[PDB]
């Protein structure tokens, strides 16, 4: 159990914005301009590390 | 060991393997069978 | 790590409601500029 | 002239649960957070019709014409007229030149559409221009919200824009307002909600919402 | 006379298809959901109004033909790890994978 909970709570912190337009990198990489879709990526990249 | 079974496990190790449920995924090809992180 | 065959890109639409274009053309009479006339569309596969 | 009286109070047992989304789901237990009719509640069983203060969402059963809406009143601004009409269950939206009594049984137009026992249920929530409408029609056996569980299945979604803050029927008449709660739903091997729990009715239906399960075991549980 | 007010471009226009594939990595756009996976058959009963699908963790797992009404079954494209088995570079330079 302890081991299954630990994973399922890692493949679920993927659908979390951490203060970002959306949690789909595709979206943010369209509804936004190249020099702004960087700041809103490092919000995701940082909370996933 | 019971020489009948194809596992050759004692009458009591067979009750210990049917009472402990599982959650692995070393399957060679795999609504979802526990293993839902693979993806 | 391995993989990738993603080759094609299935698209989704295949049966839909068309614009009312043409309904703004082959009609018999037209407005006399002193009646410019107006007809604004919205919400329908507009087919240019 | 007015048919009858106008007020009272009854209980909304386990009644008023709609399918909150079109995402199919199976043998699962989801914890939502929509706007539903708190379980074991108070239904103002009316039975005339003043301008009901329709507010953030409104239930409305009726077991045995259509309805109306509008922040203001007669032709002057927005409204509606879901008018079950046999042959076709018509609809419409506009100023509205009806009457103080459009007894049964006009300007800018900006939308149109058509197309013994009876447990007519219905909810009329309004979110993001998409005035929603769910429903479910079973037979019956009694007279009071026949105690039971059946979830309403989305029916329309008129993409209108009318700001509604009042309403009325146009000739059962129950009428429970809706609240922002949180529920735990049970979806069966076909994706039909076959049960539910309100995470703030009792102390035990909040332990069941932390353990995400409809069957708790002996013990002391930290719940809040 | 066109115009782009606050709400959307609803009227909008016709988009094309590509026909379904089934049994082959293919990227996709059924309705407006995206992703990359093998679109096999199915066995679900998406109630007469529920399009997509989702598992005990929230991941599209099925869609219905947006224009032939059939339940699909997204299954992810293969991936894993590559391990090289060496007998030692002092011995040989032959490997297995």
Method for this entry: cryo-EM
DSSP structure class, residue E27? E
Contacts of the segment E46-52: beta carbons below 8 A, 24+ positions apart: E46/D24, E46/D191, E46/E71, E47/D24, E47/D153, E47/D190, E47/D191, E47/D192, E49/D19, E49/D22, E49/D153, E49/D154, E50/D19, E50/D22, E50/D23, E50/D24, E50/D191, E51/D22, E51/D24, E52/D22, E52/D23, E52/D24
Task: Indicate left, alpha or beta for C31 from its phi (over 0: left) and psi (-120 to 50: alpha).
Answer: beta
Measure the CA–CA gap between D62 and D80, rounded to whole angstroms: 19
Residue E41 CA, distance from chain mean position: 13
Question: Which residue among D24, D28, D129 places its CB closest to the CB of E47?
Answer: D24
B23 and A8 in contact by Cβ < 8 A? no
Cα distance between the two ends of chain E? 64
| Mutation to test the E interface, candidates A6, A12, A13, A16, most E Cβ within 10 Å | A12
Cβ contacts (< 8 Å) between B38 and chain E: which residues?
A: 76
Measure the CA–CA gap between E10 and C45, rounded to whole angstroms: 8
Of residues B12, C12, C37, the one with CA closest to residue E68 = C12
E11 and C43 in contact by Cβ < 8 A? yes
Type and span of the H or E element at B13: helix B11-17
Phi then psi dihedrals of residue A27, to 5 deg: -35, -75
Chain E: residue whose CA lies nearest to D19: E50
**Residue D116 near residue D142, CB atoms below 8 Å:** no
**Residue D165 near residue D179, CB atoms below 8 Å:** no
In angstroms, the Cα distances linking D67 to C43, D127, D129 are 27, 19, 19
Q: Does B23 touch chain A (CB under 8 A)?
A: yes
* Shortest CA gap E36–chain C (Å): 7
Place of tokens 């106008």: D6
Q: Which two tokens stand for residue E29?
A: 């756009």
Measure the CA–CA gap between D81 and D92, rounded to whole angstroms: 6
Give the other-Cβ count within 10 Å of D162's Cβ.
19
**Residue D16 near residue D59, CB atoms below 8 Å:** yes
**Residue D90 near residue D83, CB atoms below 8 Å:** yes
The C-alpha R_g of chain D, in whole angstroms, comes to 19
- DSSP string computed for chain D: ---S-----EEE-S---B---S----SEEEE---EE--SSEEE--------B---SSB---EE-------SS-SSSS-----B--TT--B---SS----S------------------EE--B--EETTEE-BB------SSSSTTS----B---B--------S-B---------B-EE--EEEEE-TTS-EEEEEETTSSSSTTTTTTTTSS---SS-----
Cβ contacts (< 8 Å) between E50 and chain D: which residues?
A: 19, 22-24, 191
**Residue E22 near residue E3, CB atoms below 8 Å:** no
Measure the CA–CA gap between E74 and E62, rounded to whole angstroms: 6
**Residue D151 near residue D18, CB atoms below 8 Å:** yes
Between chain C and chain E, the number of residue pairs with CB atoms below 8 A apart is 92
């Amino acid at each position: 159990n302890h081991n299954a909970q630990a994973l399922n709570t890692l493949v679920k912190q993927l659908s979390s914005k951490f203060g970002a337009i959306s949690s789909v990198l595709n979206d943010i990489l369209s509804r936004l301009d190249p020099p702004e879709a960087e700041v809103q990526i490092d919000r995701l990249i940082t909370g996933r590390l | 060991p019971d020489p009948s079974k194809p596992s050759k496990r004692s009458p009591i190790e067979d009750l210990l393997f049917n009472k402990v449920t599982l959650a692995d995924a070393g399957f060679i090809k795999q609504r979802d069978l526990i293993c839902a992180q693979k993806f | 790590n391995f993989r990738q065959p993603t080759e094609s890109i299935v698209r989704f639409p295949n049966v839909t409601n068309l614009c009312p274009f043409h309904e703004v053309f082959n009609a018999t009479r037209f407005a006399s500029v002193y009646a410019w006339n107006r007809t604004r569309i919205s919400n329908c596969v507009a087919d240019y | 002239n007015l048919i009858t009286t106008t007020q009272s109070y009854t209980n909304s047992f386990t009644r008023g649960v709609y399918y909150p989304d079109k995402v199919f789901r199976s043998s699962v237990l989801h914890l939502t957070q929509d706007l539903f009719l708190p379980f074991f509640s108070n239904v103002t069983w009316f039975h005339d019709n003043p301008v009901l203060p329709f507010n953030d969402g409104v239930y409305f059963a009726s077991t045995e014409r259509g309805w109306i809406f509008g922040t203001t009143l007669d032709s002057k601004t927005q409204s509606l007229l879901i008018v079950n009409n046999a042959t076709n269950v018509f609809i419409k939206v506009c100023e509205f030149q009806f009457c103080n009594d459009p007894f049964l049984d006009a300007n800018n137009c900006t939308f149109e559409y058509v197309s013994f026992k009876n447990l007519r249920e219905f909810v009329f929530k309004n979110i993001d221009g998409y005035f929603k409408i769910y429903s479910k029609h079973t037979p019956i056996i009694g007279r009071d919200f026949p105690q039971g569980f059946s979830a309403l299945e989305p029916l329309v979604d008129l993409p209108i824009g009318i700001n509604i803050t009042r309403f009325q029927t146009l000739l059962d008449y129950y009428v429970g307002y809706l609240q922002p709660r949180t529920f735990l739903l049970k979806y069966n091997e076909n994706g039909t909600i076959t049960d539910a729990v309100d995470c703030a009715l009792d102390p035990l239906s909040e332990t069941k919402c932390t353990l995400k399960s409809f069957t708790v075991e002996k013990g002391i549980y930290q719940t809040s | 006379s066109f115009e782009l007010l606050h709400a959307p471009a609803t009227v909008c226009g016709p988009k094309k298809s590509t026909n379904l594939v089934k049994n082959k990595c293919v990227n996709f756009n059924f309705n407006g959901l995206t992703g990359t996976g093998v679109l096999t058959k199915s066995n679900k009963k998406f109630l007469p109004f529920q399009q997509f699908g989702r598992d005990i963790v929230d991941t599209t797992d099925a869609v219905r033909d947006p224009q032939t009404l059939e339940i699909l079954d997204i299954t992810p494209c293969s991936f894993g790890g590559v391990s090289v088995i060496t007998p030692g570079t002092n011995t040989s330079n032959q490997v297995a994978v």
